[PDB]
From a paper:
Thousands of outer-arm dyneins (OADs) are arrayed in the axoneme to drive a rhythmic ciliary beat. Each OAD is divided into two regions, a head that contains AAA+ rings (rings) for ATP hydrolysis and a tail that holds together the whole complex. The tail is permanently attached to the MTD A-tubule, while the head region of each HC contains a microtubule-binding domain (MTBD), which binds and releases the MTD B-tubule depending on the nucleotide states. We reconstituted the purified OADs onto MTDs to mimic native arrays and determined the structures, by cryo-EM, of free OAD and OAD arrays bound to MTDs (OAD-MTD) in two different microtubule-binding states.
Cryo-EM classification reveals that the OAD arrays adopt two distinct microtubule-binding states, [name]-1 and [name]-2. In both states, the relative axial positions for α- and γ-MTBD are fixed on MTD (γ-MTBD is always 8 nm ahead), while the β-MTBD position is equivalent to either α-MTBD in [name]-1 or γ-MTBD in [name]-2. The OAD array is dramatically remodeled when β-HC moves one step ahead from [name]-1 to [name]-2, coupled with five major structural changes throughout the entire OAD-MTD complex. First, an 18-degree rotation between the β-stalk and β-MTBD is required for microtubule-binding state alteration, whereas β-MTBD remains in the high microtubule-affinity state42. In [name]-1, β-HC adopts a post-1 linker docking mode, which is precisely switched to post-2 along with β-MTBD stepping forward. From [name]-1 to [name]-2, the α-linker docking groove on β-ring is also switched from groove-1 to groove-2. From [name]-1 to [name]-2, LC3BL takes over γ-Ig-PT to contact β-AAA4L. Fourth, the tail of OAD is rotated downward with respect to the head from [name]-1 to [name]-2. Comparing with previously reported dynein structures reveals that the ADP-bound state43 has a similar linker docking mode to post-2 of β-HC. Therefore, the β-HC in post-2 probably mimics the state after one complete nucleotide cycle.
Author numbering:
A (entry chain N): 4 to 117
B (entry chain L): 1 to 111
C (entry chain O): 13 to 132
D (entry chain M): 1 to 87
E (entry chain J): 16 to 110
F (entry chain K): 4 to 93
G (entry chain R): 1 to 75
H (entry chain E): 12 to 62
């Protein structure tokens, strides 16, 4: 429990990164972000910094790998499949799909036993 | 109808020279035609000025019928090492490097 | 070489080349599985997951049993839409390596990322 | 120290040629990357010369591109060649 | 500055060159030495390695190998390989 | 005593100073620095400012190397006991 | 394992002579000193520099093993 | 004592990822009359000194 | 940015966010600087696939610029078609022909420019230090005296 991977903890870390970059969350929020070639490069690096830092703050002794993909406002068919080779009791892999107005992004977190 | 094997091939008939594509914002049929002409042109005058090779390539694409996307005049720049950013007509820019030649070729139309 | 022997004691590592060996293996596997470039239908999306499952087994076969392999396969349709995917993974520097291969057809783009972490 | 660039050949106005050289000196120091230098010149020229512009910086390259009359200037700095044309 | 031994050859533990290419280059250099000794007709073995690099890697590779030498050079990302075999150090940077 | 050297530089094309600069720079740099790694960095830096970038120079008392260089940009000379090789590629 | 190779006998025999001469000990191994013993006994060369020159040129050397025999074979 | 890896590490778990569908046009016009693309034919160069 | 303590007092090691595979340092020559410039700090971020596309949303800032370019080209085409139609009697020239007609040898000039490049050459140079010889010297009081005498 104290040093055991939790699916709920991983989801909150990804949520903090999405909120930190552009999310004021539902009501009392006035954010309209449009994907741009210059902006997308900055967003992937910035989002990765927040997810790793957010995971690390409450992080246990687990190897962490994070992959970020930004969809170009949908209008195409994209399917992402995640395969992880790790002891089931020791680790779990969670993939989260986020809808953020004009730009759609998918965040995947990999947990490795240490 | 052909030496060794009868009726040739749909794939066997067309051979493409080895090349590396940095970016390919153009129709596949148009890009394949340009690569064959570029490889033949370089082969015709090896160790020759890039400007001379570029002039022949620009004439060939312009001369061929149904290869015109309109807007800006067709213009191709060939340099072993060069860095640039040019506004171009949508789906009219082809960028490729021939592996044997080892020289990057840039073809696009700017209006 | 007492120091070299000492280096084995802190971490065995078993650092078999993984930068292009996995990349060469994934690239060869992706071309055969992709088959026709033109197909991009809704029914094919279910089929894309099947390709990912086959890929993980091949990584273990190519001298990677000691390492733990995490592989993510993304299948998308490109109509000139621009999307950039960047992956950052925290691992013991020089004790782990990853292989990434990107294959783009005229109408279909397939990207496979493989992550290997040493464990014992 | 970087001396003022010498233009091998150009088709520009006396007032216009000075502006290109002035923009070129600022662009080279501001961006180390060759592509970045080309990107800066095109954007600055867009406000002054309108929507259509193109900038290419190559240490060694040879090519011929159609350009609008009086809008084409080519200047070579020490050990570097920069070519910019309009439409 | 921390030297490491891989595949029987001493090279920088953090490898400037790609892991795939670096292993191939080290194996080729060892095979070349097994055939031609560094001490006699040493110039010929270095030339053979340079030609071999062009066949399987991007062209204009620069190869310098000497018992004792000091050099600093500008190379492309993941195109610099430095390793020591016995008492001889081989340094190659791709341009 | 530098009995045999290889000279491949332009003569009377106004690039005559490159050969002269290489001999002068090597003698001044080698005596003051007195380090094989330092000599290569100093010779490369002086040549880079005067004739532009993409210049690679390696200095070793005893070494064997094979490299591709731009025509008329490669000069090989011996400064005292030390041997210095400088050439321009790209 | 020979394969049809005549070659000279006068020299091939000489090596064996000088070899067993110092190797008579029957130790089964050869050192860098033994190789010079012969030339030191008869006085073939003036200094070890000579024998060491050719030998060193062959490839490399060490303390003692057996391959040292090459010294005579090449001598 | 020091780390060992005798415990079995053979389990694999896979979780699917998907994006909810929407009209393909999505109030957008495909491409542009003029397309701007930046292409670099020169690889990045890093200088390392080994003595 | 955390450190993991190895069991049985092993040498300490820690994990880092930075990707090891990415080049340790990136150096780009600056013409203004006139000397090679090296930046130790790197982005250290890895992207498996990067895609740039020409997709624009309705009423975008970029879209307005594109509309202006189309209008400016259309205005020149409209003026050229109208002037030719006005100048001639009952002109039947097509819009596509007028666009081709608008381009003129004086109107558009094409020049091909190339940069001189030295031919690449491959040369092999071998250096080998002066031959060294072994010298043995024995000095005795009588020998020193004999030379002195």
């Amino acid at each position: 429990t104290d040093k055991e991977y939790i699916s709920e903890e991983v989801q909150k870390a990804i949520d903090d990164s999405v909120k930190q970059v552009f999310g004021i969350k539902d009501d009392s929020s006035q954010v309209t972000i449009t994907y741009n070639k210059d902006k997308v490069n900055l967003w992937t690096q910035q989002i990765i910094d927040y997810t790793i830092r957010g995971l690390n703050k409450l992080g246990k002794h687990f190897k962490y790998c994070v992959t970020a993909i930004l969809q170009q406002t949908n209008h195409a068919g994209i399917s992402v499949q995640i395969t992880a080779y790790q002891d089931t009791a020791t680790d779990g892999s969670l993939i989260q799909c986020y809808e953020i107005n004009d730009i759609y992004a998918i965040v995947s977190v990999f947990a490795m036993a240490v | 109808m052909s030496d060794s094997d009868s009726d040739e091939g749909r794939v066997v008939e067309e051979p493409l020279p080895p090349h590396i594509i940095r970016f390919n914002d153009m129709a596949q049929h148009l890009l394949k035609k340009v690569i064959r002409q570029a490889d033949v042109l370089i082969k015709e005058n090896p160790q020759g000025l890039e400007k001379d090779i570029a002039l022949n390539l620009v004439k060939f694409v312009k001369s061929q019928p149904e290869f015109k996307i309109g807007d800006g005049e067709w213009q191709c720049i060939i340099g072993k090492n060069f860095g640039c950013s040019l506004t171009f007509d949508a789906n009219v820019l082809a960028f490729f490097d021939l592996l044997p030649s080892r020289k990057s070729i840039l073809l696009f139309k700017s209006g | 070489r007492k120091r070299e022997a000492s280096l084995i004691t802190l971490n065995y590592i078993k650092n078999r080349f993984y930068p292009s060996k996995i990349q060469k293996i994934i690239k060869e596997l992706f071309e055969d599985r992709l088959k026709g470039v033109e197909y991009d239908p809704n029914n094919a999306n279910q089929l894309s997951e099947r390709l990912v499952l086959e890929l993980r087994e091949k990584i273990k076969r190519g001298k990677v049993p000691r390492y733990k392999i995490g592989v993510q396969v993304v299948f998308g349709e490109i109509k000139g839409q621009g999307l950039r995917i960047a992956s950052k993974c925290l691992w013991d520097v020089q004790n782990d390596n990853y292989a990434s291969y990107t294959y783009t057809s005229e109408k279909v783009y397939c990207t496979g990322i493989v992550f290997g972490c040493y464990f014992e | 120290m970087n001396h003022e660039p010498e233009v091998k050949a150009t088709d520009m106005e006396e007032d216009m040629i000075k502006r290109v050289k002035e923009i070129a000196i600022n662009a080279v120091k501001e961006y180390k990357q060759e592509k970045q230098i080309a990107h800066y010149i095109k954007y600055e020229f867009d406000k002054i010369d309108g929507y259509g512009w193109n900038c290419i910086v190559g240490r060694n390259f040879g090519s011929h591109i159609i350009h609008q009359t009086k809008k084409y200037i080519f200047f070579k700095i020490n050990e570097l060649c920069l070519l910019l044309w309009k439409a | 500055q921390q030297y490491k031994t891989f595949m029987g050859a001493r090279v920088l533990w953090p490898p400037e060159c790609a892991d795939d290419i670096l292993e191939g280059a080290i194996r080729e250099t060892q095979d070349a030495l097994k055939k031609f000794e560094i001490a006699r007709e040493g110039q010929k073995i270095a030339e053979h390695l340079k030609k071999y690099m062009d066949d399987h890697f991007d062209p204009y590779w620069h190869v310098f190998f000497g018992k004792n030498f000091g050099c600093q050079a500008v190379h492309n990302k993941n195109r610099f390989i430095y390793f020591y075999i016995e008492k001889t150090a081989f340094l190659m940077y791709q341009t | 005593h530098a009995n045999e050297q290889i000279i491949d530089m332009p003569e009377n094309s106004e690039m005559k100073s490159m050969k002269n600069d290489a001999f002068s720079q090597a003698k001044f740099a080698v005596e003051n620095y007195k380090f094989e790694n330092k000599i290569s960095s100093h010779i490369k830096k002086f040549f880079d400012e005067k004739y532009g970038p993409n210049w690679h120079c390696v200095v070793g008392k005893h070494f064997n190397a094979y490299v591709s260089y731009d025509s008329k940009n490669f000069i090989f000379f011996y400064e005292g006991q030390l041997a210095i090789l400088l050439y321009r590629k790209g | 394992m020979a394969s049809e190779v005549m070659n000279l006998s006068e020299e091939d025999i000489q090596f064996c002579q000088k070899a067993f001469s110092d190797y008579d000990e029957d130790g089964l191994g050869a050192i860098k000193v033994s190789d010079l013993k012969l030339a030191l006994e008869n006085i073939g060369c003036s200094l070890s520099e000579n024998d060491l020159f050719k030998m060193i040129s062959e490839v490399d050397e060490k303390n003692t093993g057996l391959i040292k025999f090459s010294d005579f074979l090449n001598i | 004592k020091e780390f060992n890896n005798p415990i079995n590490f053979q389990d694999t778990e896979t979780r699917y990822g998907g994006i909810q569908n929407q009209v393909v046009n999505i109030n957008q016009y495909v491409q542009r009359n003029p397309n701007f693309i930046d292409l670099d034919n020169i690889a990045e160069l890093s200088e390392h000194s080994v003595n | 940015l955390t450190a993991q303590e190895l069991n049985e007092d092993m040498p300490s090691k820690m994990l880092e966010p930075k990707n090891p595979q990415a080049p340790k340092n990136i150096t780009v020559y600056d013409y203004y600087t006139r000397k090679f410039k090296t930046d130790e700090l790197v982005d250290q971020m890895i992207v498996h696939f990067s895609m740039d596309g020409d997709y624009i949303w309705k009423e975008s800032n970029e879209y307005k610029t594109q509309e202006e370019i189309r209008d400016t080209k259309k205005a020149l085409i409209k003026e050229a078609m109208r002037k030719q139609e006005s100048e001639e009697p009952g002109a039947n020239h097509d819009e596509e022909a007028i666009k081709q007609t608008l381009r003129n040898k004086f109107n558009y000039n094409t020049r091909e420019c190339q940069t001189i490049n030295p031919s690449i050459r491959e040369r092999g140079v071998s250096t080998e230090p002066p031959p060294s010889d072994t010298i043995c010297g024995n000095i005795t009081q009588w020998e020193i005296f004999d030379a002195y005498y």
